[PDB]
Amino acid sequence: MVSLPRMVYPQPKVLTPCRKDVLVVTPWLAPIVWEGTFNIDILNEQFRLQNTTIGLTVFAIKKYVAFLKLFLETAEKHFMVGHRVHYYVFTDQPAAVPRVTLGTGRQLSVLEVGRMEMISDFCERRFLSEVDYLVAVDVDMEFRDHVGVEILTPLFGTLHPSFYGSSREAFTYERRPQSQAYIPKDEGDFYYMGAFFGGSVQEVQRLTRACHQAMMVDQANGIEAVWHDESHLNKYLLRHKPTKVLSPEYLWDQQLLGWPAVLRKLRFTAVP
Amino acid sequence: MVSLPRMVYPQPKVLTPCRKDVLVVTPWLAPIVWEGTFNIDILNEQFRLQNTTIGLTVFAIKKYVAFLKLFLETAEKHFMVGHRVHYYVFTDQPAAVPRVTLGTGRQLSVLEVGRMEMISDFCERRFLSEVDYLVAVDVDMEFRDHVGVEILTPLFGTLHPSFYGSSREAFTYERRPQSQAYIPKDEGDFYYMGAFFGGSVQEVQRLTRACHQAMMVDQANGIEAVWHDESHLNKYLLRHKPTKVLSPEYLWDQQLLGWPAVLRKLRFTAVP
């Protein structure tokens, strides 16, 4: 709504593509986010002028509480820096949550538990009032480079690092027709990983509510989808196309997959 | 909101870009629409499921009423075919509007006049109720190929065919600091043409209301911007970035500019 200020930056040239090596837009005209496709300064302005608050939801259960210190400390270094961030840590051990020092405008809530349910059901009203966007990630990860407002959009998925070069026949979708998550062999755009997705609060409540109900249906029929909540996420994102797709720069494992030349940055990676 | 049906189409491959010759995304992550970037079948489904109505506004004044027959007849062949379309023809000669036969779900209103004002002021309430998107074009044009729902977005501009290969210093922006349309030599992404823009009703009313007020201010100071309403449009789109940019496939003149290889389709062109 509100007008951008004067800014100086390099002229985008229509006859010089920045990336020639990768697909940067999906067939339904959603950006695929790769280094070199965005000007972070333009994007930071747009989102700052809107006073954007980003929620990051993370689950730290049993032994996984050991990963929170490095998770949060690297998040403070690299995640949405300059913007308002609210961390929601779902844990069974509230007293084992490390004391991490947070930048200004950043806050942390510890929520005790006894996942798709948790985001959609219990914390329905709360998320609606406190944040503009919600991002859900796994805790056994660390930020290594910039992850910012370029990712933000009504609904996004992230390309699974094992499958970005594969044919759809190789994707590990649910292949049993009796599951709600069933996808035939001739369907599918991408294989999305369940460890990094988000969007606006409304699109995430919708997504998690849909996956939760479909998992309940599978449960009544005594069937469990091959990759659990990831299988249902892939089904949802097939039928409701994400408005941005994150490249595997946003979800990598260097130990297992090295560092191919297509990745100019490794932003968010598995912990040894 | 509503779910897409099963569809069969070629798998988008992340490591095979479709266009390597042109920029297909802006630095603020808006698609630039070129042939080969979109799957029209996916897009037609998304927009049909929403029951989308598109308004096309056109001004046919004095001698320009001579262009309406070819304009409307080629529009019936190529513009948003399969979707609900409402033409609004603003004219000083209602009786000279040709009788053109329209496809099902398509309608035409003739509105008498004595442009940025007309779209923003008089027809404020009307457009809000009747259509989801509004597109404004010049009448001295004809459709030669597909122009469809790929263009639709909250706010779009179109690249001026004379300037898509130019540096920003060459753009014919308003350069006098006394004009509201003033853009310094080191600012500017693109030169947008005033003959083809649109978006959702709300974003267009906003845009035309802003340009109208800025033109009134220039008028009080006895200044008229070098390219009139186009100068102000460029200023608005500098400060409020469009969410899609149309390539010069959507606005060409073959007589003046030929047919370079970058253009795989000429969709909407000047009349000899």
From Swiss-Prot, chains A, B:
Descriptive protein name: Histo-blood group ABO system transferase
Keyword DNA damage: no
Signal sequence annotation: none
Binding sites annotated in the UniProt record for an alpha-L-fucosyl-(1->2)-beta-D-galactosyl derivative: 160, 172, 230, 253
Part of the whole protein covered: 64 to 345 of 354
Cofactor: Mn(2+)
Enzyme class: transferase
Keyword Protein transport: no
